[PDB]
Subunit: 134 residues, 4 copies
């Protein structure tokens, strides 16, 4: 449980599926959004992706490779590997597994911005400090 | 085309379906949201449901009776009957049809609010004036 | 563990909100589906809303009143009251609370069907014996 | 009508946004799915992503870069560039513009499959003859 902040688990529900009977594009975002939110909560102690009126996180890039399908009722495990690319950027890599078998892998790059001017902004030292602890 | 502001048509797409192969709960909201937005645009000339920083519309109540299923690729027609219940409230009744055959009917009650205090607020006369014209 | 099948807790997420800063129409479906799904699992011990190839639950009617908004981060408690209307239809009444104040109330009505012919069907006694308790 | 199959226009809706006041991850799927669906209809004359019981398209990989945000009400133009990678896989590259400035770029890769066995399958010549034009 030492790395538990990097592990998120849940089941595929009706609203994660479309008529092809497999999880859909937006369902993977719920899964990886839940994983990043927990991580930040437990590692940093702050809300995500809206931290405050002067600091938000927005997605600058996204990628996913869907190796295998996941169906309604599958218990998924998501594994997170955050990489701090700068005082403005984080790549959250993730893997999705069913019973230890990889189904999906990808990443999202998020940028810290001050939403009032809507430009990128350097993350406070407190947050960087928390983020550097494995 | 005189009542065209009350008529909205579109097809059911992949993302309106879940694994039961029929349109899902949120897909009807896209359909009825598109219908109300067009109506307000053409009848009133303003954006919806966020009109400005001092005036928004939020849903206070909703109802739907789903008589028949709609499937991927169905061309749906939505018919709107707005009833102005007060200077603060509108019931947007709707019907959904496939080839003239009713599939769905319901309503949403929307309230005008000033979001800065988050309380109900009376709609300007200009808007009421526009809304009263059939 | 008194009435624990009937109580579900959840938290408002970024994907539950729209630009009005509050939970949107589909979010409430997320909440009540989770509540109903959990109830069925614990009380009947079966999957929901697709039980098997011959037995599905489909929504016939939905209703909600939104007394108060819920926002990103709020924790919520859904209370369920299943009402068995017939050998084949259930009305799942629900309330949403926040810090123990009522924010939302509603119901969905669900009907058991055979999806191969798409007509409603009596719930098996297996299932009805278990639902009939409590 | 030069390259009209490749151009799609859409508008950002309330259901395309989250509490950050901008279009969210799934919204972009809404846009590019509509773009791809329209292209397939006009170029090949078939439904997408479910062509028939023996032929579906499923996403194998997705990628996007979000240069600029889009907001509620913005009109958008999606530009499509289909690249045929094999007898069974297509890479649908896309750009999103707003007031003719680049906001977003990406691709999804789609594979033709038989869903009854769930293995990839060569696209029929009917379909490939039509896709191969332009
Ligand atoms: C259908 C599926 C199993 C593919 O089945 P398969 O036939 O066993 O897959 P293969 O690995 O043989 O792929 C077939 C071809 O596609 C190619 N392919 C797979 N991924 C590719 C990609 N990312 N880019 C380009 N080509 C790709 C393979 O190289 C192979 O090429 P080939 O013509 O040289 O043989 C697929 O992996 C799948 O079900 N993925 C799940 C998709 C999903 O759930 N999508 C969710 C989107 S939200
Ligand atoms: C499956 C469906 C066709 C019902 O099929 P059916 O068997 O032909 O339907 P019936 O009209 O005979 O309904 C069966 C029973 O349910 C009852 N019922 C239907 N709607 C009801 C409701 N709103 N409240 C209470 N009971 C209801 C009927 O009165 C009937 O009662 P009975 O036991 O006295 O015979 C259903 O109408 C349907 O497919 N609706 C589409 C649902 C859908 O697309 N849901 C989308 C949700 S987002
Ligand atoms: C904004 C909100 C608090 C209303 O604030 P309020 O100032 O207390 O508004 P009121 O309760 O006095 O109601 C406004 C008026 O419309 C009427 N009204 C409210 N709900 C109604 C309903 N469901 N049907 C018909 N009329 C209704 C009221 O009677 C009142 O009329 P009145 O002044 O003549 O008495 C509202 O309850 C709310 O925030 N709801 C939650 C919105 C939400 O989260 N939903 C969207 C998610 S899908
Ligand atoms: C806020 C926004 C304009 C960035 O503003 P900006 O101040 O110009 O930020 P920059 O372009 O200088 O990039 C910020 C930093 O992160 C880096 N960065 C940006 N995108 C990156 C990416 N995709 N991968 C790795 N690093 C990246 C930049 O190189 C820069 O680092 P630097 O200062 O060392 O050069 C951003 O482009 C944006 O609004 N994107 C749209 C967000 C959105 O709508 N997406 C969510 C919907 S799903």
């Amino acid at each position: 449980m030492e790395n538990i902040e990097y592990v998120f688990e849940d089941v595929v529900r009706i609203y994660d599926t479309d008529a092809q009977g497999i999880a859909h594009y937006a369902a993977y975002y719920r899964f990886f959004t839940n994983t990043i939110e927990k991580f930040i909560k437990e590692k940093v102690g702050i809300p995500y992706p809206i931290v405050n009126e002067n600091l938000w996180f927005v997605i600058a890039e996204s990628h996913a490779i869907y190796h295998r399908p996941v169906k309604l009722g599958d218990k998924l495990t998501v594994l997170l590997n955050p990489k701090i690319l700068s005082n403005k950027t984080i790549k959250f890599e993730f893997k999705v597994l069913k019973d230890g078998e990889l189904t999906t892998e990808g990443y999202v790059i998020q940028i810290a911005i001050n939403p009032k001017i809507w430009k990128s902004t350097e993350m406070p030292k407190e947050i960087m400090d928390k983020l550097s602890i494995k």
